[PDB]
Enzyme design. Structure first.
Site, PDB file in Angstrom:
ATOM      1  CG  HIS A  46      -0.502  -0.028   2.579  1.00  0.00           C
ATOM      2  ND1 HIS A  46      -0.967  -0.632   3.633  1.00  0.00           N
ATOM      3  CD2 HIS A  46      -0.142   1.282   3.029  1.00  0.00           C
ATOM      4  CE1 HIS A  46      -0.252  -0.240   4.752  1.00  0.00           C
ATOM      5  NE2 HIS A  46       0.157   1.158   4.569  1.00  0.00           N
ATOM      6  N   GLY A  59       2.383   6.393   9.547  1.00  0.00           N
ATOM      7  CA  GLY A  59       3.914   6.245   9.026  1.00  0.00           C
ATOM      8  C   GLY A  59       4.474   5.047   9.767  1.00  0.00           C
ATOM      9  CB  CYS A  93       2.634   0.929   7.268  1.00  0.00           C
ATOM     10  SG  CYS A  93       0.899   1.304   7.673  1.00  0.00           S
TER      11      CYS A  93
END
Lengths: 305, 305
Positions: free
Chosen positions: A41, A143, A145
């Site tokens: 993603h 942030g 991830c």
């Protein structure tokens, strides 16, 4: 003595964290040998996340669109591929700090350490468990991830989790390092509700053994039970059923303390039925289930890495 | 979202841990520049610890009696001195992994990370607080002495604790890196009882702000209080008195949430008087006091190192 929620030392993993930017999206990657692993993603806008077609979005991305930075230093991307829900960015430089490592897919009830990172920089380390509903209860801001979960066995890092998603209920979902989500979750901003967050019974029993070893003893009683009787109570209180395999795993702690596993089950049965009555066990007012039997043996024996 | 008991990343400190052996005693040292810091009781037998005269015991020790090992590699000891309750072993090699560092002496209520080590090898990392009675509630087995506590500000490690002693009640005592014990404790195996372990009120309030920020809201009420009224309740429940300085420190969290500090004090007053009624806050059934206001801001904002 004393018993703490304890994470693995994070240094070996700190040496693997990088920043990955695709367009306006920045998150974390894991740099092992000449591959950087990150959530797919990274290629999505907030808008894309509502209904992303990842193969279609990825066609519009080239190697040079994946900005990979290790501290102050840019890494050259010489290939990219999608594996399930992760991207593998091939770089022209092997991470010189690559530890001995494995990718493992953990079972519900297993614990691991998370190195929470932002912009490829470690912020903190904490210990958590794969919940029976395949969520984790982490601490993840925008942030974070690409932050990873791991266990260490002496010098070998077993990576088991990469952070992808927060559900609307504020619990967390992610993948193994092959990019397969734990549980039914998907990398889309959609209606995803978690199932019952049941209590990991074998871990609660391990922690009651830890309590006895560390002198917290008040909850020991004159009773025993059977697996079937205990499980009638487990079911009522949304505890995982206890199996003979769990009893076998608790054998060493039973041996160490001289408290039969089914006697400890009877102590747990009374705690469930009667509550704590305003008392604490190892500084907790609730039955802690994010220590495995292996964690309790490890911490109580002082194993190092 | 989510809020975890989170330690600093441990890598910078892992790179400083060494094994120190004097005769039959092995524990941990901290290697910074060309000095290794360790508890002076490394020179004691179990017998010596009952009534040690450290200057007299130290006369019988030479540089070559202090065996210092960094991983598999022996360090050459070219000098030794005693500073309060620590030894400073001068070695002929500067630690090439020495981070930017400071020695700080922390106040009761301050939190820090501990890197628990055995034989100079890191075992785990956990977050704890200097208690108002100058003990810490750690996880320390035989061989853990010389393990350190620290905070990190971006790239600078502030070392604040070195582990020395377990009291008979299984709580922990140690020194700053100048070798001065926190509180009244001494490095002797003698009658040392801890004072009242009061609750760090300003930290409980910070954690209630963290709860509101992370959507745990049920304990907010229609009430306010004054410092003096709140402190009447604090005193009854063995909470630290709240000062205007604490109120000022909570200002940013009050600003972020729009909940006046004294309104949150009124919520805390009701929780103390009424209890939790079987409810939880950020997964706790008791009021957590080992997050400082700075910890809550840091974790809720995603500060990195």
């Amino acid at each position: 003595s004393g018993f703490r929620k304890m994470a693995f030392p994070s240094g070996k993993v700190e040496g693997c964290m990088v920043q990955v930017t695709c367009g306006t999206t920045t998150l974390n990657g894991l740099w092992l040998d000449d591959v950087v692993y990150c959530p797919r993603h990274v290629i999505c806008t907030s808008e894309d996340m509502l209904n992303p077609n990842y193969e279609d979005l990825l066609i519009r991305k080239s190697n040079h669109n994946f900005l990979v930075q290790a501290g102050n230093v840019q890494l050259r991307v010489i290939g990219h591929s999608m594996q399930n829900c992760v991207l593998k960015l091939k770089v022209d430089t092997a991470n010189p700090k690559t530890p001995k490592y494995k990718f493992v897919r953990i079972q519900p009830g297993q614990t691991f350490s998370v190195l929470a990172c932002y912009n490829g920089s470690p912020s903190g380390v904490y210990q958590c468990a794969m919940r029976p509903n395949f969520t984790i209860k982490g601490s993840f801001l925008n942030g974070s991830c690409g932050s990873v979960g791991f266990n260490i066995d002496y010098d070998c890092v077993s990576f088991c989790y990469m952070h992808h998603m927060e559900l609307p209920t504020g619990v967390h979902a992610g993948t193994d390092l092959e990019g397969n989500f734990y549980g039914p979750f998907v990398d889309r901003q959609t209606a995803q509700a978690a199932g019952t967050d049941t209590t990991i019974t074998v871990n609660v029993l391990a922690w009651l053994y830890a309590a006895v070893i560390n002198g917290d003893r008040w909850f020991l009683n004159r009773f025993t039970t059977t697996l079937n009787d205990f499980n009638l109570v487990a079911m009522k209180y949304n505890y995982e059923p206890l199996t003979q395999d769990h009893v076998d795993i608790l054998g060493p702690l039973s041996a160490q303390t001289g408290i039969a596993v089914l006697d400890m089950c009877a102590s747990l049965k009374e705690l469930l039925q009667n509550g704590m009555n305003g008392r604490t066990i190892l500084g907790s007012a609730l039955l802690e289930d994010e220590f495995t039997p292996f964690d309790v043996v490890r911490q109580c024996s002082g194993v190092t890495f």
